[PDB]
Design a protein around this ligand. Structure first.
Ligand SMILES: OC[C@H]1O[C@@H](O[C@@H]2[C@@H](O)[C@H](O)[C@@H](CO)O[C@H]2O)[C@H](O)[C@@H](O)[C@@H]1O
Ligand SMILES: OC[C@H]1O[C@@H](O[C@@H]2[C@@H](O)[C@H](O)[C@@H](CO)O[C@H]2O)[C@H](O)[C@@H](O)[C@@H]1O
Lengths: 417, 420
């Protein structure tokens, strides 16, 4: 009896059950049993690299977008250009999403886009009205963003449930995901994490442009726009603070729209003032433009698979509009296939339509074999910058010295490929 | 039993399936066939069609946007239609820009039959231009006359009789998925191109001097106060609504606005509004190196897995031919793709539609590249960043050049790697 083995991460509330519901029509159509194994993200990395070196593993694995370069460069993934042609090729994806289909600069695709993580700003419509801040102006530009946070700091408005003021902005500082939160500020200033110029990749974290963007963002906590407790918190803790009426503004993904529709007893926040006064806007334009951070996850086929033709049919199914919409629903993500965004499921909620507006500006990291190493060094040095911010000690000079250290370590890492 | 044909279409007319089934009923009766129609939203149609192409399961005929013909043709899944095109009158029966959309660039054989044409020209408020002392023949003759006319429209005290407020001189979308089509005439009129052969291969020409000249000419008009910054955050339909509502002296659109001006608001038109009662149209002005009208539209293609290519070719001959051409241009608000249909009294009796036919004479399309979807995606991404600077008054020639240099690097990578 035909079987496929698929490894996935915990993408949805009941990961195995949801994936089995997702693929049931495919199973029934081709008389195949898809065997799913759920792996936490760090357990997944170990298992996948072990499969790559040993030549023993599943047919398909989920990959984070930032893992495609490293696993591709091992020479263990089957080309999937034919799958991607079936789904509509380069045209059917945002350019930032298309970049994650391959090792940077490779002719052959080795991963199929599955779902997209992207971030935009949620805001309390009641808080901004009370502060005399127009959201269209506040999220248009860095100048409007800083000016609106100042007006939010001054506002006498109190949440009608907490009976207390709102922090103007809640954001995590030091966290493993700190580079994703920084990236739109680096990019909007004209900077980069690493850039390809002069026949090689180099750190750009200590460029003038990158330092301007980083200092703009990190300095907002020192100006009193971000409360001290936000900088002691992880991504989920900040989401809870926004739901609980403690934040006027915070960056998250499309999952918060679904949560605002669901009672707290089902893991949502529909009863709370925030859910009833919810707006969303893209990140603001910097001096060199407007960018939305993209991540998410792709699917890859190991080239030692004994089931490649059937595995490619399953990749076409998972990558295709029906499954794209269903899984984006299950995960609270955006479909990776842009064709799926035309689905009435998206077109019928004005807040989700705003995420699709945000998506036009999408930007990803380069798909480098050495990406994990680059990101680790950038996270370590930005975490030291955020530690200075939590003490009110960050200067442009202190930030420059931390990014000069990151750039030296990164350039030595990039030397190794 | 009736023979069967299946056709996939997009939502081209007010009642897409019903209008198409009306259009083909005479063919059905002539050939003892039932034509099954399936309507696909424009945003899902491409993936459904490439899924059909690769699986070998689908309709007999599909609609294709003109800009899709190269990509689907290169997949090797379409049946040659040179025979059908010769039956309809051959190369001389079509405008050259329309003929170019019948095949993959450089291909030995035609794979698509022209169905209908999208083209754009400038609508203008005849009352606004009179009040501003602008002669439409001068304003729409040259880029210098166009900018001089907008300056007089900005200075004018004229108020719309209904809004009781001044009109913006020009309304245009900025960032929109269709932003390349609005830019194209300005790139072309300067002697520029989006992609052209250079050193024997297709490469970006968006960072060429001529392209940058034409783009800066057009994009800079917003910074001079001729376009409202909120226009640059609006889609194509919202801008048509602003013109109907008396907010805009001048805006580019297709021939569908002429029929809308005739019909009451209750029927989806704007006959009650000042704009409907003071409506002029002119072709795009000539640039330094020429006058060009953007052409798009849709063609019909025959999949090589069709079970009845001779009967499907009879349906392509019918849809491509004079009677059907006139009827479907009526239903859709578009221009017929077949040049002989432009002589129908339904065009020739209406002076506004006669001006679209004048505009049509300058028609120009993108090259029919296999990689076009990639090119357009990347060109839209980077023109979006340029229009975002315009909305802030921050577009310099240097900033524009840097954005087009980035666009060109990405486009050149795409063209190099395009999968066959
Ligand atoms: O860095 C590895 C990959 O991480 C993914 O982010 C996931 C996130 O979506 C999920 O909510 C949590 C649960 O732990 O894990 C995060 O780290 C990104 O989407 C990928 O781009 C990235 O490759
Ligand atoms: O990009 C694909 C094709 O788009 C057609 O334009 C249609 C337009 O006429 C219609 O108003 C809207 C509704 O969404 O869909 C547009 O994109 C063009 O005429 C083709 O040239 C192009 O290939």
């Amino acid at each position: 009896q035909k079987t496929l083995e698929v490894w996935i991460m915990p993408n949805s509330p009941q990961p195995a059950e949801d994936f089995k519901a997702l693929v049931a029509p495919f199973e029934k159509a081709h008389g195949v049993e898809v065997k799913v194994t759920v792996l936490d993200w760090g357990v997944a990395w170990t298992k996948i690299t072990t499969a790559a070196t040993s030549g023993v593993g599943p047919d398909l694995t989920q990959l984070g977008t930032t893992w495609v370069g490293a696993i591709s460069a091992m020479g263990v993934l089957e080309p999937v250009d034919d799958v991607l042609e079936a789904l509509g090729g380069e045209k059917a994806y945002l350019p930032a999403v298309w970049r994650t289909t391959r090792l940077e600069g490779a002719r052959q695709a080795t991963a199929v886009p599955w779902f997209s993580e992207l971030r935009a700003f949620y805001y309390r419509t009641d808080a901004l009205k009370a502060a005399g801040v127009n959201p269209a102006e506040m999220f248009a530009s860095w100048q409007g963003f800083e000016a609106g946070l100042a007006r939010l700091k001054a506002s006498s408005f109190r949440d009608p449930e907490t009976k207390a003021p709102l922090a103007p902005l809640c954001t995590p500082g030091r966290t493993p995901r700190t580079l994703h939160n920084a990236a739109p500020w680096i990019w909007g200033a004209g900077g980069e994490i690493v850039r390809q110029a002069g026949g090689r990749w180099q750190s750009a974290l200590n460029s003038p442009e990158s330092l301007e963007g980083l200092y703009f963002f990190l300095s907002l906590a020192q100006k009193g726009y971000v409360p001290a407790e936000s900088l002691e918190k992880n991504t989920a803790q900040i989401e809870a603070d926004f739901q609980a009426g403690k934040c006027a503004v915070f960056a998250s993904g499309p999952w918060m729209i679904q949560r605002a529709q669901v009672p707290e007893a089902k893991g949502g926040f529909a009863e709370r003032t925030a859910a009833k006064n919810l707006g969303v806007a893209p990140y603001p334009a910097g001096p060199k433009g407007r960018y939305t951070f993209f991540g998410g996850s792709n699917l890859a086929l190991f080239n030692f698979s004994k089931n490649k033709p059937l595995a490619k049919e399953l990749l076409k199914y998972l990558g295709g509009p029906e499954a794209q919409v269903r899984y984006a629903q299950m995960t609270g993500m955006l479909p990776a296939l842009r064709s799926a965004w035309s689905d009435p499921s998206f077109q019928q909620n004005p807040l989700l339509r705003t995420f699709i507006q945000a998506a036009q500006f999408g930007r990803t990291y380069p798909s480098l074999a050495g990406w994990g190493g680059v990101e680790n060094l950038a996270v370590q040095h930005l975490g030291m910058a955020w530690d200075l911010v939590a003490q009110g000690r960050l200067t442009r000079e202190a930030l420059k010295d931390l990014m000069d250290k990151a750039s030296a370590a990164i350039n030595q890492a990039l030397r190794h490929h």
